[PDB]
């Protein structure tokens, strides 16, 4: 139910390619995205499990 779960995935400005999970509310589940390795927003997880625990349902 938290609003940060509805934000777009945030790669950020760094140039790494790090697989992270975000909740996609229009899908109703967690998806993979590329994180750059700095300045993570809150819709950004190490597992889908981590992701659902926090954002699932949203």
């Amino acid at each position: 139910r938290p609003d940060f779960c509805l934000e777009p995935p945030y790669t950020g400005p760094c140039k790494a390619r790090i697989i992270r999970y975000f909740y996609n509310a229009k899908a109703g589940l967690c998806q993979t995205f590329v994180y750059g390795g700095c300045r993570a927003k809150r819709n950004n997880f190490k597992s889908a499990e981590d992701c659902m625990r926090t954002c699932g349902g949203a």
Partner: protein, 224 residues
């Protein structure tokens, strides 16, 4: 690398990749035992691959060597990206040959306008995603400190400089981080960050390696 070209298979022996589950960063081989990367590329376990051109298609030249020490700059700021540089000591020294070889550290700062070579297996699209299997290269000049500042007001510290094109269309991208910016045979830059990739008036920002020559010597000596 956006708007670049496939590297000659023969020509960048100093180019390494850092791997965990997958390829996540690049690096530069700077002595038989040590690699320079970005501090934002830090992970607790890394295996360095050496001698790659195509990261999916092995030509037989490749070496797979674990990092035994992974040492971020002690003044790296996770939010401003200040001092974004890191050293890795390999567990065994690399076997030196035509495909695995070192690059010179800088002996001076690079003059604005100098032509540099940036390289990496980073995204080749500014939007969405094409992560290439083949190593890509970009010819790019060092920009002035004033151009760099004008592009990124509030964000450019003393450890940072810009290399690229204010018109956009050519730049480094995700998965390029930690990799080399080479200017006349010397490693002048480490791929760090930017606003998007290849956006107008938003060139790549790179760490000024010349600023860490002492630290790298000290660290390498502290860690024999």
């Amino acid at each position: 690398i956006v708007g670049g070209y496939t590297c000659e298979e023969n020509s960048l022996p100093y180019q390494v990749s850092l791997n965990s589950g997958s390829h996540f960063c690049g690096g530069s081989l700077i002595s038989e035992q040590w690699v320079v990367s970005a501090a934002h590329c830090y992970k607790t376990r890394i295996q360095v691959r050496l001698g790659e051109h195509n990261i999916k298609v092995l030509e037989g030249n490749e070496q797979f060597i674990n990092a035994a020490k992974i040492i971020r700059h002690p003044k790296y700021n996770r939010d401003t990206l200040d001092n974004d540089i890191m050293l890795i000591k390999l567990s065994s020294p690399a076997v030196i040959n035509a495909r695995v070889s070192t690059i010179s550290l800088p002996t001076a700062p690079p003059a604005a306008g100098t032509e540099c070579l940036i390289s990496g297996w980073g995204n080749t699209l500014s939007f969405g995603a094409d992560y290439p299997d083949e190593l890509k290269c970009l010819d790019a000049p060092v920009l002035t400190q004033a151009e760099c500042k004008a592009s990124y007001p509030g964000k450019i510290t003393n450890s940072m400089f810009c290399v690229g094109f204010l018109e956009g269309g050519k730049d480094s991208c995700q998965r390029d981080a930690g990799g080399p910016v080479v200017c006349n045979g010397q490693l002048q830059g480490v791929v760090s960050w930017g606003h998007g990739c290849a956006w107008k008036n938003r060139p790549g920002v790179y760490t000024k390696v010349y600023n860490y020559v002492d630290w790298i010597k000290d660290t390498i000596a502290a860690n024999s």
